[PDB]
């Protein structure tokens, strides 16, 4: 299947309180379990003591508007270059913005 953690991490998104979710991230990244855990041992002993660009459209731009033109190959080309950057969410909604 997959690494036993991430699957359950995802399936939390359905029924359970998301409260249980973030701890697993520790279990994951802290899974590297450094003897820098002493840092975590420090860190938790610090926990305890808390008390006591528009150019992208120009990138989106294509030659000879409107899209009805015969160069649809150029259209899928440009949108493919965007597709390479369409991964990023932070600017995906910006595209949607």
């Amino acid at each position: 299947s997959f690494p036993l953690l991430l699957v359950l991490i995802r399936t939390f998104y359905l029924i359970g309180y998301n409260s249980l979710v973030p701890f697993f991230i520790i279990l994951e990244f802290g899974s590297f379990l450094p003897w820098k855990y002493i840092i975590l041992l420090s860190l938790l002993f610090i926990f305890r003591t808390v008390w006591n660009h528009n150019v992208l459209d120009v990138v989106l731009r294509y030659i000879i508007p409107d899209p009805v033109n015969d160069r649809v190959i150029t259209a899928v080309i440009k949108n493919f270059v965007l597709f390479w950057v369409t991964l990023l969410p932070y600017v995906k909604e910006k595209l949607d913005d």
């Binding site: 690494p3 359950l8 995802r10 369409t86």
Partner: protein, 180 residues
């Protein structure tokens, strides 16, 4: 939901009889390329559902898949395009798997990519938002999932790429017509 439970019981009996040697595990591993030369269609049909072991890890994996299916299928009557897609989905992987024949089975790829597509579809829905610390939404995890998977578990680059790239092409073809 019915069809969900059909897929479920399929996975169950498949992996079960697999762990019991009631049927030969040799046939399931069969992916397309060997099949092209061999000419044996059915040796991928069963592969639609297989996970190998009938144990708790696999139990929960099947139930995760079932949860995503209860999320999606009953809500797929909304988006008819998934019918238009799955075959094409079932299509697109072929030349893609034409290099590696990943031991990741079909149904795995299929459902994980459907998750990816659903996440890209309603990405704006910040339907889970821990205020103050994790102010996030869908379409931020799956990259975190797969990329870091590559880092710590060190799978094959292109093989992992196959996990989602088809889904991204599908979403591309979805939004381009909305743009053109």
């Amino acid at each position: 939901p019915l069809v969900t439970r059909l897929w479920t019981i399929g996975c169950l009996v498949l992996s079960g009889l697999t762990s019991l040697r009631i049927v030969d595990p040799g046939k399931v591993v069969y992916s397309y390329d060997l099949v092209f030369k061999k000419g044996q269609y059915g040796r991928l049909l069963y592969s639609i559902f297989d996970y190998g072991a009938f144990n708790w890890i696999s139990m929960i994996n099947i139930f995760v898949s079932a949860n995503h299916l209860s999320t999606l299928e009953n809500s797929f009557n909304l988006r008819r395009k998934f019918c238009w897609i799955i075959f094409l989905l079932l299509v697109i992987l072929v030349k893609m798997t034409s290099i590696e024949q990943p031991a990741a089975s079909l149904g795995v790829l299929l459902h994980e990519n459907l998750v990816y597509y659903e996440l890209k579809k309603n990405g704006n829905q910040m339907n889970v938002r821990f205020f103050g610390a994790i102010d996030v939404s869908p379409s931020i995890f799956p990259i975190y999932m797969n990329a870091v998977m590559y880092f710590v578990y060190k799978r094959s680059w292109l093989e992992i790429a196959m996990n989602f790239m088809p889904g991204h092409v599908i979403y591309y073809m979805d939004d381009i017509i909305g743009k053109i």
